[PDB]
Design an enzyme around this catalytic site. Structure first.
Site, PDB file in Angstrom:
ATOM      1  N   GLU A  67      -6.851   1.310  -8.561  1.00 21.54           N
ATOM      2  CA  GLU A  67      -5.497   2.349  -6.701  1.00 21.54           C
ATOM      3  C   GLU A  67      -5.629   1.644  -6.056  1.00 21.54           C
ATOM      4  OE1 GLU A  67      -4.598   4.943  -6.692  1.00 21.54           O
ATOM      5  OE2 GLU A  67      -5.647   6.484  -8.096  1.00 21.54           O
ATOM      6  N   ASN A 114       5.043   7.873  -0.070  1.00 21.04           N
ATOM      7  CA  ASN A 114       5.333   8.816  -1.643  1.00 21.04           C
ATOM      8  C   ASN A 114       6.794   9.475  -0.482  1.00 21.04           C
ATOM      9  OD1 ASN A 114       2.704   8.271  -3.620  1.00 21.04           O
ATOM     10  ND2 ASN A 114       2.592   8.890  -1.283  1.00 21.04           N
ATOM     11  N   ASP A 161       7.825  11.925  -0.965  1.00 15.92           N
ATOM     12  CA  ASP A 161       7.691  13.789  -0.168  1.00 15.92           C
ATOM     13  C   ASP A 161       7.287  13.322   1.247  1.00 15.92           C
ATOM     14  OD1 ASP A 161       4.949  12.749  -0.559  1.00 15.92           O
ATOM     15  OD2 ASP A 161       4.046  14.748  -1.122  1.00 15.92           O
ATOM     16  N   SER A 200       3.851  11.135   2.776  1.00 16.83           N
ATOM     17  CA  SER A 200       2.613  11.156   2.884  1.00 16.83           C
ATOM     18  C   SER A 200       2.757   9.793   1.992  1.00 16.83           C
ATOM     19  CB  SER A 200       2.201  11.792   1.091  1.00 16.83           C
ATOM     20  OG  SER A 200       2.073  11.882   0.397  1.00 16.83           O
ATOM     21  N   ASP A 251      -0.975   7.102   0.931  1.00 11.90           N
ATOM     22  CA  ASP A 251      -1.520   6.624   0.333  1.00 11.90           C
ATOM     23  C   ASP A 251      -2.807   6.012   1.137  1.00 11.90           C
ATOM     24  OD1 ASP A 251      -1.430   8.419  -1.637  1.00 11.90           O
ATOM     25  OD2 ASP A 251       0.164   7.059  -3.233  1.00 11.90           O
ATOM     26  N   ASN A 284      -4.842  10.438   0.040  1.00 12.72           N
ATOM     27  CA  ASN A 284      -2.953  10.702   0.201  1.00 12.72           C
ATOM     28  C   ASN A 284      -3.188  12.157   1.485  1.00 12.72           C
ATOM     29  OD1 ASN A 284      -0.720  13.295  -0.296  1.00 12.72           O
ATOM     30  ND2 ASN A 284      -0.212  10.819  -0.502  1.00 12.72           N
TER      31      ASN A 284
END
Ligand SMILES: [Mg+2]
Ligand SMILES: [Mg+2]
Ligand code: NA
Length: 129
Positions: A35, A46, A48, A50, A52, A59
Site C-alpha cells: 500500500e 483518486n 472520485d 477522495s 488515500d 481512503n
RNA sequence: GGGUUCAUCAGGGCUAAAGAGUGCAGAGUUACUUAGUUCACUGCAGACUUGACGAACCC
C-alpha cells in the site's frame, strides 16, 4: 517517517494486529509494504475526489475526514491528518474497523494483489517481536 | 632518567574462527540495522593497553 519492515512488525504486534480477525501479523506487514512502501506520510488522490492516507492508504470517502472529499462518511471518526503520523495508533484503530466490515483484508487492493495466498510469514522473518 | 615487578586509580579498545553485526548475562527508550541468539539501555568478568601519585630491585 518510513518504517523498517521489522520495526513496523513489532509496532503492529504491540497494537494488537497479530491474528486480528484471523489475519496473521505478516498479512498486515505485507499490506503496508504494498500500500505505502511502509511510508507513514504517503498520499494518493483518486478520480472520485477522495485521497488515500498513510501507512495503510485509508481512503477519505468512507473512513477519515479531510474536508475536501465529496460524500465523506467519517466512519473512523478521525481527521485524515491523524493517519499521517509517525505514531501508527490511528491507522491501526481505523484498519481494525475496516477489516471487520465484511470482506476482511480484501478491502486493501494491494493486499489482495500482492499478499493474499502467499507466504506472508516471510514478512516477519528475522524480526524481534 | 629508563627496565622488571608491585599497589591504588582513571581511561581505551579486545574477549576463537566466521559474520555487516554475537565477551558473558539481563533489558526494550523504534533509535540504528540487511532487524538482531549479533541492536539504543543496565550489570558483571578476563587478558591486555594508556595515563597519574607512588614502592621494591636492576641498569
Ligand atoms: Mg572474533
Ligand atoms: Mg546481548
Ligand atoms: Na546473517
Amino acid at each position: 517517517k518510513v518504517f523498517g519492515r521489522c520495526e513496523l512488525a513489532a509496532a503492529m504486534k504491540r497494537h494488537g494486529l497479530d491474528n486480528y480477525r484471523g489475519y496473521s501479523l505478516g498479512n498486515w506487514v505485507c499490506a503496508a509494504k504494498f500500500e505505502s512502501n511502509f511510508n507513514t506520510q504517503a498520499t494518493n488522490r483518486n478520480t472520485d475526489g477522495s485521497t488515500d492516507y498513510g501507512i495503510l492508504q485509508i481512503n477519505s470517502r468512507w473512513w477519515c475526514n479531510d474536508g475536501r472529499t465529496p460524500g465523506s462518511r467519517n466512519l473512523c471518526n478521525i481527521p485524515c491528518s491523524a493517519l499521517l503520523s509517525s505514531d501508527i495508533t490511528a491507522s491501526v484503530n481505523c484498519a481494525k474497523k475496516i477489516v471487520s466490515d465484511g470482506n476482511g483484508m480484501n478491502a486493501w487492493v494491494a493486499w489482495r494483489n500482492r499478499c493474499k495466498g502467499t507466504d506472508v510469514q516471510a514478512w516477519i522473518r528475522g524480526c524481534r517481536l
